[PDB]
Amino acid sequence: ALLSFERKYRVRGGTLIGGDLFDFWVGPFYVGFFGVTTAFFALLGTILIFWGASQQGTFNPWLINIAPPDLSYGLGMAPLMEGGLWQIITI
Amino acid sequence: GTGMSVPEFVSDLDTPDPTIEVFLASTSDPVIPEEGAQTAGEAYENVDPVL
């Protein structure tokens, strides 16, 4: 479903990378290489957040808490339950 | 994750109190009292706390 003046603007080209491999629309949204990357990263982050919420013991929106590791771990990696999920979600 | 911490410069953590070395240069070990030792009250005229 397009606006009454939208069709003439829906042309091909103007991509930084990908050409016509990802040059199309899904509803109103425009898809590209970076649309695919955005969808992947956002879905992974959301699902990881809800996995951490399930393992915490609460699904209350006000009470979900995912926290960074302790100061003793420094700049290294922490166990995924003791603050590593936070690092993954940050990435 | 609560933000509860105390920051300090590393160069300031390595600097001790400049008066600690003064105390260690003006202290001495105690002397164990002997049998029938003469007290300071029998050698001078002083105050009872220090007698």
PDB file of C-alpha atoms in Angstrom:
ATOM      1  CA  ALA A   1       0.000   0.000   0.000  1.00  0.00           C
ATOM      2  CA  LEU A   2       1.614   3.197  -1.292  1.00  0.00           C
ATOM      3  CA  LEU A   3       0.755   6.848  -0.906  1.00  0.00           C
ATOM      4  CA  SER A   4      -0.857   8.523  -3.908  1.00  0.00           C
ATOM      5  CA  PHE A   5       2.443  10.279  -4.765  1.00  0.00           C
ATOM      6  CA  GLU A   6       4.956   7.578  -3.769  1.00  0.00           C
ATOM      7  CA  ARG A   7       5.214   5.371  -6.864  1.00  0.00           C
ATOM      8  CA  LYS A   8       7.384   7.697  -8.963  1.00  0.00           C
ATOM      9  CA  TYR A   9      10.030   7.827  -6.206  1.00  0.00           C
ATOM     10  CA  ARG A  10      10.372   4.016  -5.954  1.00  0.00           C
ATOM     11  CA  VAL A  11      13.294   3.579  -8.339  1.00  0.00           C
ATOM     12  CA  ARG A  12      16.397   1.425  -8.219  1.00  0.00           C
ATOM     13  CA  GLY A  13      19.909   2.453  -7.268  1.00  0.00           C
ATOM     14  CA  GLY A  14      21.638   4.470  -4.594  1.00  0.00           C
ATOM     15  CA  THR A  15      23.003   1.532  -2.587  1.00  0.00           C
ATOM     16  CA  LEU A  16      26.360   1.578  -0.819  1.00  0.00           C
ATOM     17  CA  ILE A  17      26.623  -2.216  -1.134  1.00  0.00           C
ATOM     18  CA  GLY A  18      24.399  -5.060  -2.320  1.00  0.00           C
ATOM     19  CA  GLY A  19      23.072  -3.833  -5.664  1.00  0.00           C
ATOM     20  CA  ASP A  20      19.691  -5.412  -6.371  1.00  0.00           C
ATOM     21  CA  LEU A  21      20.167  -8.412  -4.067  1.00  0.00           C
ATOM     22  CA  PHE A  22      18.331  -6.666  -1.202  1.00  0.00           C
ATOM     23  CA  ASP A  23      16.721  -3.761  -3.109  1.00  0.00           C
ATOM     24  CA  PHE A  24      13.015  -4.074  -2.292  1.00  0.00           C
ATOM     25  CA  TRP A  25      10.384  -3.102   0.283  1.00  0.00           C
ATOM     26  CA  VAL A  26       8.487  -5.014   2.970  1.00  0.00           C
ATOM     27  CA  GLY A  27       5.290  -3.068   3.531  1.00  0.00           C
ATOM     28  CA  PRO A  28       6.373   0.523   4.124  1.00  0.00           C
ATOM     29  CA  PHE A  29       9.856  -0.465   5.282  1.00  0.00           C
ATOM     30  CA  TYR A  30      12.860  -0.396   2.958  1.00  0.00           C
ATOM     31  CA  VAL A  31      15.207  -3.391   3.015  1.00  0.00           C
ATOM     32  CA  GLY A  32      18.907  -3.500   2.234  1.00  0.00           C
ATOM     33  CA  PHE A  33      22.188  -4.998   3.407  1.00  0.00           C
ATOM     34  CA  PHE A  34      22.038  -2.894   6.562  1.00  0.00           C
ATOM     35  CA  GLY A  35      18.354  -3.681   7.062  1.00  0.00           C
ATOM     36  CA  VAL A  36      19.259  -7.374   7.189  1.00  0.00           C
ATOM     37  CA  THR A  37      22.090  -6.691   9.633  1.00  0.00           C
ATOM     38  CA  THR A  38      19.819  -4.514  11.798  1.00  0.00           C
ATOM     39  CA  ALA A  39      17.106  -7.172  11.919  1.00  0.00           C
ATOM     40  CA  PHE A  40      19.599  -9.884  12.879  1.00  0.00           C
ATOM     41  CA  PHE A  41      21.287  -7.850  15.621  1.00  0.00           C
ATOM     42  CA  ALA A  42      18.049  -6.502  17.120  1.00  0.00           C
ATOM     43  CA  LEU A  43      16.342  -9.904  17.182  1.00  0.00           C
ATOM     44  CA  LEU A  44      19.386 -11.551  18.767  1.00  0.00           C
ATOM     45  CA  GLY A  45      19.618  -8.847  21.430  1.00  0.00           C
ATOM     46  CA  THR A  46      15.925  -9.018  22.313  1.00  0.00           C
ATOM     47  CA  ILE A  47      15.878 -12.816  22.538  1.00  0.00           C
ATOM     48  CA  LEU A  48      19.024 -12.820  24.686  1.00  0.00           C
ATOM     49  CA  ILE A  49      17.445 -10.228  26.994  1.00  0.00           C
ATOM     50  CA  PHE A  50      14.352 -12.393  27.440  1.00  0.00           C
ATOM     51  CA  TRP A  51      16.494 -15.502  28.009  1.00  0.00           C
ATOM     52  CA  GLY A  52      18.303 -13.638  30.777  1.00  0.00           C
ATOM     53  CA  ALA A  53      14.955 -12.536  32.196  1.00  0.00           C
ATOM     54  CA  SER A  54      13.736 -16.146  32.225  1.00  0.00           C
ATOM     55  CA  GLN A  55      16.899 -17.301  34.004  1.00  0.00           C
ATOM     56  CA  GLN A  56      16.632 -14.436  36.510  1.00  0.00           C
ATOM     57  CA  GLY A  57      13.250 -15.602  37.800  1.00  0.00           C
ATOM     58  CA  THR A  58      10.919 -12.787  36.770  1.00  0.00           C
ATOM     59  CA  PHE A  59       9.171 -11.567  33.620  1.00  0.00           C
ATOM     60  CA  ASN A  60       7.928  -8.307  35.154  1.00  0.00           C
ATOM     61  CA  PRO A  61       8.876  -5.400  32.846  1.00  0.00           C
ATOM     62  CA  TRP A  62       9.646  -3.180  35.850  1.00  0.00           C
ATOM     63  CA  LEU A  63      11.929  -5.737  37.526  1.00  0.00           C
ATOM     64  CA  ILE A  64      14.073  -7.229  34.737  1.00  0.00           C
ATOM     65  CA  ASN A  65      17.747  -6.472  35.399  1.00  0.00           C
ATOM     66  CA  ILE A  66      20.798  -7.527  33.380  1.00  0.00           C
ATOM     67  CA  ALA A  67      23.973  -6.244  34.982  1.00  0.00           C
ATOM     68  CA  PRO A  68      27.654  -5.861  34.036  1.00  0.00           C
ATOM     69  CA  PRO A  69      30.299  -8.059  35.716  1.00  0.00           C
ATOM     70  CA  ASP A  70      32.217  -7.308  38.905  1.00  0.00           C
ATOM     71  CA  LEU A  71      35.179  -4.937  38.953  1.00  0.00           C
ATOM     72  CA  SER A  72      37.552  -7.835  39.692  1.00  0.00           C
ATOM     73  CA  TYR A  73      37.141  -9.285  36.185  1.00  0.00           C
ATOM     74  CA  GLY A  74      38.807  -6.214  34.672  1.00  0.00           C
ATOM     75  CA  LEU A  75      38.550  -5.881  30.901  1.00  0.00           C
ATOM     76  CA  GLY A  76      38.327  -9.636  30.324  1.00  0.00           C
ATOM     77  CA  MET A  77      35.323 -11.841  29.678  1.00  0.00           C
ATOM     78  CA  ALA A  78      33.005 -12.947  32.485  1.00  0.00           C
ATOM     79  CA  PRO A  79      30.782 -16.035  32.789  1.00  0.00           C
ATOM     80  CA  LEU A  80      27.602 -15.609  30.774  1.00  0.00           C
ATOM     81  CA  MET A  81      25.488 -15.659  33.942  1.00  0.00           C
ATOM     82  CA  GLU A  82      27.827 -13.332  35.880  1.00  0.00           C
ATOM     83  CA  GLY A  83      27.676 -10.453  33.392  1.00  0.00           C
ATOM     84  CA  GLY A  84      28.779 -11.859  30.017  1.00  0.00           C
ATOM     85  CA  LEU A  85      25.281 -11.622  28.551  1.00  0.00           C
ATOM     86  CA  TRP A  86      25.524  -7.867  29.147  1.00  0.00           C
ATOM     87  CA  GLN A  87      28.690  -7.705  27.024  1.00  0.00           C
ATOM     88  CA  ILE A  88      27.091  -9.726  24.219  1.00  0.00           C
ATOM     89  CA  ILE A  89      23.985  -7.515  24.240  1.00  0.00           C
ATOM     90  CA  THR A  90      26.194  -4.406  24.188  1.00  0.00           C
ATOM     91  CA  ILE A  91      27.991  -5.670  21.074  1.00  0.00           C
TER      92      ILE A  91
ATOM     93  CA  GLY B   1      25.888  -2.642  38.182  1.00  0.00           C
ATOM     94  CA  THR B   2      24.765  -0.274  40.946  1.00  0.00           C
ATOM     95  CA  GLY B   3      27.560   2.259  40.396  1.00  0.00           C
ATOM     96  CA  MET B   4      28.924   1.886  43.947  1.00  0.00           C
ATOM     97  CA  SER B   5      32.681   2.455  43.791  1.00  0.00           C
ATOM     98  CA  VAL B   6      35.445   4.814  44.921  1.00  0.00           C
ATOM     99  CA  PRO B   7      37.941   6.101  42.314  1.00  0.00           C
ATOM    100  CA  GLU B   8      41.550   6.989  43.060  1.00  0.00           C
ATOM    101  CA  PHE B   9      44.590   7.939  41.013  1.00  0.00           C
ATOM    102  CA  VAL B  10      47.259   5.243  40.834  1.00  0.00           C
ATOM    103  CA  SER B  11      50.033   7.797  41.395  1.00  0.00           C
ATOM    104  CA  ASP B  12      48.276   8.936  44.591  1.00  0.00           C
ATOM    105  CA  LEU B  13      47.773   5.404  45.935  1.00  0.00           C
ATOM    106  CA  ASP B  14      51.546   4.818  45.945  1.00  0.00           C
ATOM    107  CA  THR B  15      52.283   7.926  48.037  1.00  0.00           C
ATOM    108  CA  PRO B  16      52.069   7.085  51.765  1.00  0.00           C
ATOM    109  CA  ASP B  17      51.311   9.426  54.648  1.00  0.00           C
ATOM    110  CA  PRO B  18      54.401  11.683  54.956  1.00  0.00           C
ATOM    111  CA  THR B  19      54.161  11.417  58.770  1.00  0.00           C
ATOM    112  CA  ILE B  20      54.375   7.618  59.108  1.00  0.00           C
ATOM    113  CA  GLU B  21      58.171   7.647  58.766  1.00  0.00           C
ATOM    114  CA  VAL B  22      58.386  10.357  61.438  1.00  0.00           C
ATOM    115  CA  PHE B  23      56.592   8.203  64.020  1.00  0.00           C
ATOM    116  CA  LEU B  24      58.799   5.162  63.384  1.00  0.00           C
ATOM    117  CA  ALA B  25      61.902   7.297  64.022  1.00  0.00           C
ATOM    118  CA  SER B  26      60.664   8.472  67.451  1.00  0.00           C
ATOM    119  CA  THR B  27      59.374   5.237  69.016  1.00  0.00           C
ATOM    120  CA  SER B  28      61.052   2.584  71.146  1.00  0.00           C
ATOM    121  CA  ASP B  29      60.399  -0.840  72.617  1.00  0.00           C
ATOM    122  CA  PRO B  30      59.093  -1.148  76.193  1.00  0.00           C
ATOM    123  CA  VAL B  31      61.276  -2.265  79.094  1.00  0.00           C
ATOM    124  CA  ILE B  32      59.935  -5.227  81.069  1.00  0.00           C
ATOM    125  CA  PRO B  33      59.781  -4.347  84.796  1.00  0.00           C
ATOM    126  CA  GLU B  34      62.230  -6.222  87.009  1.00  0.00           C
ATOM    127  CA  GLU B  35      61.859  -7.463  90.595  1.00  0.00           C
ATOM    128  CA  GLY B  36      61.709  -4.558  93.033  1.00  0.00           C
ATOM    129  CA  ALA B  37      62.440  -1.914  90.409  1.00  0.00           C
ATOM    130  CA  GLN B  38      62.768   1.677  91.599  1.00  0.00           C
ATOM    131  CA  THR B  39      59.770   3.761  90.548  1.00  0.00           C
ATOM    132  CA  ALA B  40      59.890   7.337  89.277  1.00  0.00           C
ATOM    133  CA  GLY B  41      58.226   8.511  92.495  1.00  0.00           C
ATOM    134  CA  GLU B  42      61.318   7.599  94.529  1.00  0.00           C
ATOM    135  CA  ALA B  43      63.721   9.460  92.206  1.00  0.00           C
ATOM    136  CA  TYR B  44      61.999  12.808  91.494  1.00  0.00           C
ATOM    137  CA  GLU B  45      58.948  14.842  92.537  1.00  0.00           C
ATOM    138  CA  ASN B  46      56.235  14.136  89.967  1.00  0.00           C
ATOM    139  CA  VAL B  47      52.475  13.713  89.471  1.00  0.00           C
ATOM    140  CA  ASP B  48      50.570  10.672  90.709  1.00  0.00           C
ATOM    141  CA  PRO B  49      49.432   9.444  87.222  1.00  0.00           C
ATOM    142  CA  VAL B  50      53.110   9.118  86.285  1.00  0.00           C
ATOM    143  CA  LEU B  51      54.345   8.152  89.773  1.00  0.00           C
TER     144      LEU B  51
END
